[PDB]
Every structure is written in C-alpha cells, then in structure tokens.
Design an enzyme around this catalytic site. Structure first.
Site, PDB file in Angstrom:
ATOM      1  N   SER A   1       0.849  -1.222   0.000  1.00 44.53           N
ATOM      2  CA  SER A   1       0.000   0.000   0.000  1.00 44.53           C
ATOM      3  C   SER A   1       0.879   1.266   0.000  1.00 44.53           C
ATOM      4  O   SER A   1       0.335   2.348  -0.280  1.00 44.53           O
ATOM      5  CB  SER A   1      -0.970   0.036   1.152  1.00 44.53           C
ATOM      6  OG  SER A   1      -1.901  -1.057   1.111  1.00 44.53           O
TER       7      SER A   1
ATOM      8  N   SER B   1      -5.991   2.781   3.426  1.00 43.13           N
ATOM      9  CA  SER B   1      -5.285   1.887   2.473  1.00 43.13           C
ATOM     10  C   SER B   1      -6.284   1.044   1.679  1.00 43.13           C
ATOM     11  O   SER B   1      -6.025  -0.162   1.520  1.00 43.13           O
ATOM     12  CB  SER B   1      -4.288   0.989   3.176  1.00 43.13           C
ATOM     13  OG  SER B   1      -3.170   1.703   3.674  1.00 43.13           O
TER      14      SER B   1
ATOM     15  N   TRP C   1       1.030  -3.355   4.153  1.00 38.44           N
ATOM     16  CA  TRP C   1       1.085  -4.759   4.596  1.00 38.44           C
ATOM     17  C   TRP C   1       0.922  -5.645   3.371  1.00 38.44           C
ATOM     18  O   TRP C   1      -0.182  -5.644   2.792  1.00 38.44           O
ATOM     19  CB  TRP C   1       0.015  -4.979   5.646  1.00 38.44           C
ATOM     20  CG  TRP C   1      -0.075  -6.390   6.124  1.00 38.44           C
ATOM     21  CD1 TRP C   1       0.826  -7.404   5.977  1.00 38.44           C
ATOM     22  CD2 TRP C   1      -1.122  -6.890   6.959  1.00 38.44           C
ATOM     23  NE1 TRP C   1       0.382  -8.526   6.643  1.00 38.44           N
ATOM     24  CE2 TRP C   1      -0.806  -8.230   7.258  1.00 38.44           C
ATOM     25  CE3 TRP C   1      -2.272  -6.309   7.502  1.00 38.44           C
ATOM     26  CZ2 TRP C   1      -1.662  -9.026   8.015  1.00 38.44           C
ATOM     27  CZ3 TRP C   1      -3.089  -7.087   8.286  1.00 38.44           C
ATOM     28  CH2 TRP C   1      -2.807  -8.437   8.496  1.00 38.44           C
TER      29      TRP C   1
ATOM     30  N   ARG D   1       3.307  -1.858  13.859  1.00 36.90           N
ATOM     31  CA  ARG D   1       4.120  -1.044  12.912  1.00 36.90           C
ATOM     32  C   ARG D   1       4.166   0.408  13.422  1.00 36.90           C
ATOM     33  O   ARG D   1       5.280   0.949  13.576  1.00 36.90           O
ATOM     34  CB  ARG D   1       3.561  -1.138  11.489  1.00 36.90           C
ATOM     35  CG  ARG D   1       3.677  -2.516  10.862  1.00 36.90           C
ATOM     36  CD  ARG D   1       2.789  -2.639   9.633  1.00 36.90           C
ATOM     37  NE  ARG D   1       1.388  -2.445   9.985  1.00 36.90           N
ATOM     38  CZ  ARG D   1       0.450  -2.051   9.123  1.00 36.90           C
ATOM     39  NH1 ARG D   1       0.736  -1.887   7.836  1.00 36.90           N
ATOM     40  NH2 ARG D   1      -0.784  -1.857   9.549  1.00 36.90           N
TER      41      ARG D   1
HETATM   42  C1  4J6 Z   1      -1.554  -2.226   1.779  1.00 39.67           C
HETATM   43  O1  4J6 Z   1      -0.379  -2.427   2.020  1.00 39.67           O
HETATM   44  C2  4J6 Z   1      -2.670  -3.210   2.121  1.00 39.67           C
HETATM   45  C3  4J6 Z   1      -3.515  -2.586   3.221  1.00 39.67           C
HETATM   46  N1  4J6 Z   1      -2.694  -1.845   4.150  1.00 39.67           N
HETATM   47  C4  4J6 Z   1      -3.075  -1.995   5.419  1.00 39.67           C
HETATM   48  C5  4J6 Z   1      -2.349  -1.287   6.457  1.00 39.67           C
HETATM   49  O2  4J6 Z   1      -2.938  -1.014   7.599  1.00 39.67           O
HETATM   50  O3  4J6 Z   1      -1.204  -0.883   6.237  1.00 39.67           O
HETATM   51  C6  4J6 Z   1      -4.018  -2.936   5.555  1.00 39.67           C
HETATM   52  S1  4J6 Z   1      -4.763  -3.466   7.004  1.00 39.67           S
HETATM   53  C7  4J6 Z   1      -6.339  -2.687   7.140  1.00 39.67           C
HETATM   54  C8  4J6 Z   1      -6.257  -1.182   6.930  1.00 39.67           C
HETATM   55  N2  4J6 Z   1      -5.712  -0.673   8.208  1.00 39.67           N
HETATM   56  C9  4J6 Z   1      -6.324  -1.502   9.281  1.00 39.67           C
HETATM   57  C10 4J6 Z   1      -5.269  -1.814  10.356  1.00 39.67           C
HETATM   58  N3  4J6 Z   1      -4.903  -0.562  11.041  1.00 39.67           N
HETATM   59  S2  4J6 Z   1      -3.780  -0.723  12.197  1.00 39.67           S
HETATM   60  N4  4J6 Z   1      -3.705   0.681  12.936  1.00 39.67           N
HETATM   61  O4  4J6 Z   1      -2.510  -1.177  11.701  1.00 39.67           O
HETATM   62  O5  4J6 Z   1      -4.146  -1.737  13.166  1.00 39.67           O
HETATM   63  C11 4J6 Z   1      -6.830  -2.776   8.588  1.00 39.67           C
HETATM   64  C12 4J6 Z   1      -4.289  -3.531   4.189  1.00 39.67           C
HETATM   65  C13 4J6 Z   1      -3.806  -4.979   4.141  1.00 39.67           C
HETATM   66  C14 4J6 Z   1      -3.513  -3.449   0.867  1.00 39.67           C
HETATM   67  C15 4J6 Z   1      -2.698  -4.057  -0.261  1.00 39.67           C
HETATM   68  O6  4J6 Z   1      -4.562  -4.373   1.163  1.00 39.67           O
END
Ligand code: 4J6
Length: 241
Positions: free
Chosen positions: A47, A94, A187, A227
């Site tokens: 992301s 994201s 992620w 993270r």
């Molecule tokens: C990108 O890399 C990926 C996204 N990115 C993320 C991320 O948090 O970096 C998720 S996870 C989803 C969105 N954020 C929430 C978690 N927040 S936290 N504060 O870390 O607990 C849940 C998701 C996998 C794309 C490719 O899907």
C-alpha cells in the site's frame, strides 16, 4: 547513540519479529533495528505505492482530490472499505480497490513511464497495471522509501508543486508536541514472508524534515498496530518526537 540503537533493536525483539527503521535527515541515512540488512533489501511496496499512484493520477488529470469513488457493493477485504471514498479517504484506509481503479485510469504505458521517470525501486511494473505493487514485480528498499518520503516532504519530486501539496495533505496523521507527522502504512500479506511498512516524515517545530521507513516481517498473527507503535517509540528514543 549506541544506547539509543540497542533500545530500538529491543523494540523489534519484543514484537517477536525482525525489522529495520531507516531515518533520513538532509542527505544522510541511518539504520536501526534487529536486522539492519533489511535497509538495502527489496520488498513489494504494497500500500506504500498509493503515494506515487496518487501523484501520477493527479498530475495527469486522471482524478481530482474531491471526486467520490463509489463502492460497487462487492465484499472488500475489510468491512471499513465498503463505502464511497475520495483518494484521501482511500489513502488513510489503504483501500486498494480505489487505487486499482486509479491505476486502470492511468493505464500500464503511462504508469510504467512515470515509475521509471521517478526511479521508484526496481521500476518494474510488469504487464498488469492493477496488479504490480502487492505481489511483484515492483520492489523497493526501505532506504529508497525513506529517500522518496524526504523528496515528497520537500516537494522535490518531478511533479507539480500543486499535486505534491495535495498528496502531502492525504498523508497527514496528527500534530504531536509541535511535530507534524505524515505516514503511509503497508502490509504485503500475500508474499512469503509477509512485509510490513510505515513510511513518512516528521516536520519538527523549526521546519526540519526527518523522513523514515519502517520495514518488518509481518509474522503470522502479528498485531498490525505494532508497525505504528515501533515507529513512534523509535522516533521518541531518537529525540525526533
Ligand atoms: C496495503 O499495504 C494493504 C492494506 N494496508 C493496510 C495497512 O494497515 O497498512 C491494511 S490493514 C487494514 C487497513 N488498516 C487496518 C489496520 N490498522 S492498524 N492501525 O494497523 O491496526 C486494517 C491492508 C492490508 C492493501 C494491499 O490491502
């Protein structure tokens, strides 16, 4: 200095994983954590690519900062994504379906040209414009991510000032003790091993810019929240926050 570095090494150890934190100030990078070799290792950006996707899309009039990307009603990987979003909403969440939509508007030819012109990581996007930044072939090092963040923070990327200003605003997290924090998490849950990112910068009160890129192995079942925790505590230990 030695005592600061040991404390950051122990942050990764107590999360039961291996990781690096690259810091850039001026043109100087320093690496901290319990696997410094990660700093110069290539990973999928996941992301974190959204930052360059947004720059390219805005620069080439493929989208605006106000336009609403409607949810098509299909199940998304996170229920939080199942709603109408701007690019900035999608940056914070994201929400990859919005950035896949934007990538298709840009198209492979323009996306490949712009990724090569910027020199982003290995600058290889392969043949699928809506499937290159999560499982390859595009890869980038944490050193390259920190350098990219530093350039965006200073608006010295080769895009308009207007578009770099707009993408900065999308990445703004919070002001903490006069410090402005800008950050994009990532992620790559679909490569083996999994990769976790947090790439961004701090604007200190007098205006000094400290760019960072955290990169760690997302072990099976690791809390995604770790993270941000390791990044903030590391920046505090370094006297950046
Ligand atoms: C990108 O890399 C990926 C996204 N990115 C993320 C991320 O948090 O970096 C998720 S996870 C989803 C969105 N954020 C929430 C978690 N927040 S936290 N504060 O870390 O607990 C849940 C998701 C996998 C794309 C490719 O899907």
């Amino acid at each position: 200095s030695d005592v600061k570095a040991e404390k950051i090494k122990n942050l990764f150890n107590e999360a039961h994983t291996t990781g690096v934190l690259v810091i850039q100030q001026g043109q100087t990078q320093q690496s901290y954590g319990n696997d410094l070799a990660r700093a110069s290792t290539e990973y999928v950006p996941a992301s974190t690519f959204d930052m360059l996707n947004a720059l390219i899309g805005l620069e080439h009039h493929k989208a605006t900062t106000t336009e609403v990307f409607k949810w098509d009603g299909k199940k998304r990987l996170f229920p939080e994504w199942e709603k109408d979003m701007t690019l900035g909403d999608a940056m914070k969440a994201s929400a990859i379906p919005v950035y896949q939509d934007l990538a298709r508007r840009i198209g492979l030819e323009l996306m490949s040209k712009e990724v090569k012109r910027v020199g982003y990581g290995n600058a290889d996007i392969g043949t699928q414009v809506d499937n290159f930044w999560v499982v390859g072939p595009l890869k980038i090092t944490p050193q390259q991510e920190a350098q990219f963040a530093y350039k965006l923070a200073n608006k010295t990327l080769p895009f308009s000032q207007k578009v770099q200003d707009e993408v900065q605003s999308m990445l703004f997290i919070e002001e903490k003790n006069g410090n402005k924090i800008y950050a994009k998490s990532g992620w790559g849950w679909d490569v083996n091993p999994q990769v976790g990112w947090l790439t961004g910068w701090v604007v200190q009160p007098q205006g000094n810019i400290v760019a960072f890129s955290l990169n760690l192995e997302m072990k099976k079942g690791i809390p995604s929240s770790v993270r941000k925790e390791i990044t903030y505590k590391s920046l505090e230990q370094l006297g950046i926050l």
